[PDB]
Design an enzyme around this catalytic site. Sequence first.
Site, PDB file in Angstrom:
ATOM      1  N   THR I   1       0.889  -1.098   0.000  1.00 49.01           N
ATOM      2  CA  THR I   1      -0.078   0.009  -0.045  1.00 49.01           C
ATOM      3  C   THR I   1       0.795   1.386  -0.176  1.00 49.01           C
ATOM      4  O   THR I   1       1.708   1.296   0.803  1.00 49.01           O
ATOM      5  CB  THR I   1      -1.090  -0.274   1.155  1.00 49.01           C
ATOM      6  OG1 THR I   1      -2.406  -0.208   0.546  1.00 49.01           O
ATOM      7  CG2 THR I   1      -0.958   0.913   2.386  1.00 49.01           C
ATOM      8  N   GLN I   2       0.544   2.035  -0.876  1.00 51.06           N
ATOM      9  CA  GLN I   2       1.313   3.308  -1.251  1.00 51.06           C
ATOM     10  C   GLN I   2       0.352   4.496  -1.531  1.00 51.06           C
ATOM     11  O   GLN I   2      -0.636   4.297  -1.309  1.00 51.06           O
ATOM     12  CB  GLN I   2       2.682   3.221  -2.168  1.00 51.06           C
ATOM     13  CG  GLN I   2       2.920   1.806  -2.787  1.00 51.06           C
ATOM     14  CD  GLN I   2       1.820   1.635  -3.978  1.00 51.06           C
ATOM     15  OE1 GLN I   2       0.352   1.549  -3.717  1.00 51.06           O
ATOM     16  NE2 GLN I   2       2.417   1.621  -4.985  1.00 51.06           N
ATOM     17  N   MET I 107      -2.151  -6.486  -1.621  1.00 54.56           N
ATOM     18  CA  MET I 107      -2.297  -5.032  -1.085  1.00 54.56           C
ATOM     19  C   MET I 107      -0.994  -4.171  -1.266  1.00 54.56           C
ATOM     20  O   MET I 107      -0.459  -3.531  -0.632  1.00 54.56           O
ATOM     21  CB  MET I 107      -2.335  -5.375   0.522  1.00 54.56           C
ATOM     22  CG  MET I 107      -3.708  -5.742   0.876  1.00 54.56           C
ATOM     23  SD  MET I 107      -4.748  -4.928   0.230  1.00 54.56           S
ATOM     24  CE  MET I 107      -5.149  -3.552   1.597  1.00 54.56           C
TER      25      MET I 107
END
Lengths: 125, 225, 222, 195, 195, 195, 195, 204, 233, 211
Positions: I1-2, I107
């Site tokens: 996740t970014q 994710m």
Amino acid sequence: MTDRYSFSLTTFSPSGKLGQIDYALTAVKQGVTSLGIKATNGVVIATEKKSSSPLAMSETLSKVSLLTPDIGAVYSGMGPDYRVLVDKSRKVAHTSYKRIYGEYPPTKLLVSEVAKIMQEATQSG
Amino acid sequence: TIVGVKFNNGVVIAADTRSTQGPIVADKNCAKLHRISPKIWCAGAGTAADTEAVTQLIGSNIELHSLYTSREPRVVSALQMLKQHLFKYQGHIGAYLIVAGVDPTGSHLFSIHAHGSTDVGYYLSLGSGSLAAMAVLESHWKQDLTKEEAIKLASDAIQAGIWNDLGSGSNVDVCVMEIGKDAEYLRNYLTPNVREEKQKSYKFPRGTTAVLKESIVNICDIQEE
Amino acid sequence: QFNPYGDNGGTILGIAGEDFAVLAGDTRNITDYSINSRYEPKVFDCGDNIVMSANGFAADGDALVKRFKNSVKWYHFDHNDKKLSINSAARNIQHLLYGKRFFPYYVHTIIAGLDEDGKGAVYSFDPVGSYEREQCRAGGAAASLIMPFLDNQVNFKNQYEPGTNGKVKKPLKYLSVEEVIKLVRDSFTSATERHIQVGDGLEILIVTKDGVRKEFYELKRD
Amino acid sequence: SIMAVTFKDGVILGADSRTTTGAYIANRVTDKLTRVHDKIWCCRSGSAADTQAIADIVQYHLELYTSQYGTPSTETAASVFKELCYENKDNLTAGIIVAGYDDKNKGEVYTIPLGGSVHKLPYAIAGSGSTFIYGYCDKNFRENMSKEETVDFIKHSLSQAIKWDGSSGGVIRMVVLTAAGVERLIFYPDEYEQL
Amino acid sequence: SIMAVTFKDGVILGADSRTTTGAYIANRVTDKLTRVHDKIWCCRSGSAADTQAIADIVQYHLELYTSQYGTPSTETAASVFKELCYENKDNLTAGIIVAGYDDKNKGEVYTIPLGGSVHKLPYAIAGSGSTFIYGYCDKNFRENMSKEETVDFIKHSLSQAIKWDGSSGGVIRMVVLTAAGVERLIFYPDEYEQL
Amino acid sequence: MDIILGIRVQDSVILASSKAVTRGISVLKDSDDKTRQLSPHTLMSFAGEAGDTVQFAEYIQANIQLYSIREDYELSPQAVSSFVRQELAKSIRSRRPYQVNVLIGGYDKKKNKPELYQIDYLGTKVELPYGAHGYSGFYTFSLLDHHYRPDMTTEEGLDLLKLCVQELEKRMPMDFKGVIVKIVDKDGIRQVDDF
Amino acid sequence: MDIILGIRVQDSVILASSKAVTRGISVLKDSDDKTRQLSPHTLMSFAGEAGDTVQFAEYIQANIQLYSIREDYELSPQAVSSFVRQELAKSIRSRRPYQVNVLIGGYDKKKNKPELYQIDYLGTKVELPYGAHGYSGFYTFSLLDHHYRPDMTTEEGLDLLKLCVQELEKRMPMDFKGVIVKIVDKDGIRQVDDF
Amino acid sequence: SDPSSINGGIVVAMTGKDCVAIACDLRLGSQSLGVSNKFEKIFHYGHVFLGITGLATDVTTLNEMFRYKTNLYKLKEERAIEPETFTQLVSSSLYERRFGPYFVGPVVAGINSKSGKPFIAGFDLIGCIDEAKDFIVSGTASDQLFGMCESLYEPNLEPEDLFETISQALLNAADRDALSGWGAVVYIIKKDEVVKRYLKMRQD
Amino acid sequence: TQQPIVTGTSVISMKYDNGVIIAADNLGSYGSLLRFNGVERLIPVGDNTVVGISGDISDMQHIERLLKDLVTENAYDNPLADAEEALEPSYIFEYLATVMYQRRSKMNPLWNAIIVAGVQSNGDQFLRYVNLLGVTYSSPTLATGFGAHMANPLLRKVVDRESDIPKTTVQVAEEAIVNAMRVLYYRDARSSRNFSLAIIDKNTGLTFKKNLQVENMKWDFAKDIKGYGTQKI
Amino acid sequence: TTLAFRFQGGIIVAVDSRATAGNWVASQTVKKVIEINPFLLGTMAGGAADCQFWETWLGSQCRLHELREKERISVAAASKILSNLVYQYKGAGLSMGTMICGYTRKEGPTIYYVDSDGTRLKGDIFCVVSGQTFAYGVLDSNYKWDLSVEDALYLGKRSILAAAHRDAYSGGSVNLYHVTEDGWIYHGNHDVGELFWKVKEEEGSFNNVIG
Ligand SMILES: [Cl-]
Ligand SMILES: [Cl-]
Ligand SMILES: [Mg+2]
């Protein structure tokens, strides 16, 4: 300052007369004639445009006033007192009726409201 | 989807006829075109209750102002009164309006955002379908449009919203306000989304529903004798 | 943060006849208030007279349908080309769904076909693999609009014999394919009117002993 | 991107024409240069609604001032803006540049940031796009420039501000304030992009 | 404030000398220009620790490259920086400009923002202070400038970046990369502030 | 949590209320009477937030007693229930709403009929043959649905209530330390000692 | 909440444990035995999070039974308590700690002495004349601090425990549906039916 | 927590040939617990019928409020309020609590006594007006009612036919909602007679 | 996740009688800063496919490398690499779609929206969309970001349904695309004037146009707009 | 609503058939009793998928036991297989409330309540009324040990009807099972809509309704 006249200026006299109301009716009697006639298919209201000066543009002074699209008003007596009543009558048609029911008030109820404003100037301080 | 398009001798506004609660269509033929005054109309987007209430309040005060001044109301007045009201409530009254009209000053087209901001344009659009509508306006708008051209452009911009926006749909309502003429309100100017005949009649045979009890309801007042 | 789920809308409807079954869905794909496609199929032929739809998040639905299609291929390989029965397909799909129990497939799954006795069958699954066999099922955004209609018009619920005053229920009966298609068309027409995510087109897959055939009907594009 | 520059003959106000909600351009022909008196104008940045509300109150206050005391000073106009901005700092998002021409004081520029502080400056820049031209404007501004020089300085400055800022764009509007009167200038993309 | 400018004879790397924790200047004589090969240098912005760690790994990777395959290209050095920055984007705060001189390719500049994307450019600017000189640099950069012209362009550019940015300050360090070799220049406040 | 039950039989209304007052893990009392006599033929039982319950009941008691003295008449249970509901319906949109749930048991001398009213802290009111508030309601409703008959005697009503309390003691996880039972009929309000 | 008490008299250890299993506002059972026989002369009572309690006790029971078969010897209560504490002390820094509180009552045949151990879910251990876990701790403790005598007999110990349960029933707000009593002496472990 | 689905319940209104119909369920609950099966949600002020779904304390409060307002109207106007006018009064009354609203879904049904024209309307909690020709729905099973009405309804149904349609629309919608049912009432409304029928339905 | 850092805006496309057209502007924005101009976001794969990419540019450059690596790998032990066993648009799409859904399911997504335009072996028009969620769909017109809201409505007026595709010439199709790019420049605060356009025709092959500019813009009407309502000067 | 109680004649198992998603009624024909083997029954409460999947899995594990040991699995052993499995997934968000009911020569009639929390309890009566598990019936007054099988069936049916009426999330139909020596017997599915009216008329109960 402050309005220190918090008391009635219209009181009963020993004879049971309200002086200021009688004197108001006397002012109306001095006023120019106005009339109204009801037909089967309409009503007419009429009055004389008593021009104060010929230099005065009598068209600019409206004695017969629209209150709602279906209600008109004419007067006899003090013109300024009529002009402010027409303003209050137009406004109360909106605040006390049209903004609630979404239609203009019937004749008898708008009359009832104008009648109330005049009664209060008969008892209020 | 609501649009306003200025033309040579007037201004035209149009809107779609759909109101939605979440993903559900609440009304298939909503009226988003509001009479502020006889020759001043506005189209509303955002909270449906807010746009109706705010147009009725200002329309009322505009009528009292018109009677007080003995002058036909001006668009700049309705505009000023709307923005000062909306600004007071800091966007909590979610009324987004396109305000058009003709007055003694000429033809005017404004838009008003819920925080109390206004803008001037020859063409405007507002609501979820504004980007679909603005895409058509930016493609086909020119200076010195005729009345016929401006109606065509306005309704085409609404169609773009109806077809490509899920929040817009059903019919196109138009109102033309030409200088020195009566404003003509064209309710259901286009009917592009008419439902087809069902395959079956779902009319039931009488006595299908089980009834516990029956009774006459007295709607009449207390009687005489 | 990054959200791994989305909603692509649409609605699927499965009805089981005496000797047939139908699985229908709208061809509209949406995100938020934008229309992605007016024609993007959601009802697939998976082989062995099985039709499958996974409605919800389109990515999860495409992945699941692929895995089941793959699952059918390996059934043939490992079991001497045995035809996969609808009850066996249903149980297999439960295991596919439950595999991602702690990262679910955000979809509503309906499969239609004929049972081993040759009678029409519909199976309905929740996202995490709970499944049950039914006569009627609607899935997706407009499920709440359609299912009550189907209860009333397919199972004759809250309908009684006239003159009994609720004493005797309307007799249950098997509907013809022609009657069933009318109900499917009416259900989608109604759902299109009142649901913003339903419209554009309707694709129906009918399953019989003879095989799988496809009917398409246009829906309102607003 | 908004700026006000004081030159020999008076002051010039420059602004871009873009209004945005997120990344959508709500209006591409915005007039961010607004009249509060005949020769007192302001540049509006921040909330469209807040700046419009404040500008409307100031125009009212100066119209009433003029009725009673005659033409107000640019300093007086700046003070009224400051009073509204400071006392309502908690509820306002407004960055305003006030520019005006007197005959006694000639051209004057006042800038009012978010706090509601006042700064009198030979020139001023404000808006999101202003950050990209701090270096350029500081190197190129001279005092007592000609009209033609000052129009060039603003055109070149806002040209750069528009180029690097997503929030800035459209046409470059300008308003010249001198003894001679009030002149409106417009410069289209095809002109200022090739600079 | 960091920049790399490609001119006729090669490339020049410029940087300020300020390192901060909040508003405190941790180091006022910082060297943000770092060697990864004899004629491949980088400009470091963002986290001091992250850029130092990445620069150290790249110097290692190019030293091992040189052992096996001979002198690496500037493109190759940029690629190694990108690989570390992209694959560890979640855990890194690093903005790096890679500048180098080949004899075949002459002067080359590559910029690597936060994402870990690569952009080959005639010149590049980065750091917090870079935002204030976007307008200035775009108007004043020409291709195939002389050494003296390019030193002036960087000196004037970072001079403005330092003036407007609290995070930029101290001395202007520069590194000239040509066929002739490697030259270090320093310019003190008393010199560049009066420009 | 607090148990308040009401059952309306042929000729009376019986109210059973838990005698335990607890705040958290502490038992404050085991003999608490959660009832106020509103009028000679009207009884109110209340459960809810500490303080609010008694304050609300005593406030309602005072208002109904004031009406009785002023008109030398007893308000009908229907009238008393409506007054109570309206006071609660005012309080939900007040600065600090009363968190009180009440049962109103009364005998209407005009109609010679017993009446039971259930009102929640929002001002939700219904007339019921039997009613209850809290966790206890879930259980007791299902039991009363099976056994309750509308032409039951007071003695039959007490036995059914006795069964409800016994089953509640086994099934409920908290100790409510028994109940106090009060009967409302034509003769007035009396407390059943044996229970 | 769950009641587990332990009293160590002259010649035995008595454990009283609540018979109710409740999750939220539901009572699952009114005959639950919260005890496991670790060895012929060692008994463990447990209270805590659902599942963890039984799983932990049965796991400990299996390990102690394994030791008994392998060595044909009974581990001393001191040794059994230390093993149990260490298993809990491991679990606190584990991915999901066991939320179990235990009382260990045993008779040491070598020393001919009864022993009582109190261990919490953290692995906190003490040897006590009397012990308890949860809300019932504060009351019982003070009561026993007054009545307990080191040379009390088993019959005297039961009477004191009987008093503690009676006082707990009145004072506690939750219904724990009585207790099960088990005695640990030289002859072994027996359950007292009459209580 | 969500005020408009604590107590539960539904209302539906339909137009026919020279008639209107309005119907509601009888359930009142505290979420999952059913408390009362005698909680009618349709009230009448003269010949104008008002159904209210949502928070039950507000249903009762608004009934008492509109009885109050229509009583004063009749005394002043010297005539019963009409559907069109009452619709505007409901809207007005809801929007005056804009920033503290009643959590309700009102539905107006009735025949204009002068024009004889059938009339129905619906409102959101802050008083926006939906004036549909065909049908109006409100409550916890609004989605289900929209589905049933959109397929079952055809225009210009005779009173005894319209009864069957609206009854089957309510019953089948309620049976797919946990917080609706426990009985149902249907009002068939003609210019000068109104029949009220209680429907047999499942009590689960 | 970014979170995406350097980003590209709308990619727009449509089918016509003989092939497909796709377009995208040459900007790489660093938030509100229009930092990189001259960023190419249309990446050709052989002579039958163009992949248009919006979103994170670092992730785009990664995908660019995967496609470059896909061409290399396809050629390995493949005598018909430039003929019958050349990469099809459908193959290139299904690969990217596979990667996108796998990355979302770990994710750690590739923060992009992708449109694959091309012509297949049998001359069939190919146009399909995939994004960071692995969501896929096809339509006669496809667009990402703002394009979806503004470009699609305009392109759908030329091709509304499948039956309209044979009736749409390349001249009409290109005109529609060029106009849509001008509308996006007017109205997207993250767009540039400079763009690239690619035509893939079943007869004339792949035509790639660079350094195209939005022209024939309407601004003259701006001079006549003063104030926000009441101002006359 | 799931009910399982013990009496002289064996075990009575009664369940409802309603499945809900929030306020939405997804199904009224859900089977909440899983027939593990001819002598073993499992009730399902909580997550539909969790209960269906793991109780079906339990049937597999019970079948393997029979093969490997040439004997019926004990209710105690079968219950503990499921209880030990869920305990591994404890804290992962499994939602399961379940009763394993069977008869074996070794133990006689046995009911075990198995929880997603890892709780395993043996008792004579278990009831799950939406979200709540109880050791007592919804009525519990009529419960005496010596009851007629056909009399005991009615109590179980009546008990589900009570909960179905009051509880919004319970309803549809009642499924009845009788567990004895030499297996369990299905006692049919009874639609609550039809059942309610019949029961009311015959018993003269639900007077608060009206019909
Ligand atoms: Cl503005
Ligand atoms: Cl450093
Ligand atoms: Mg720009």
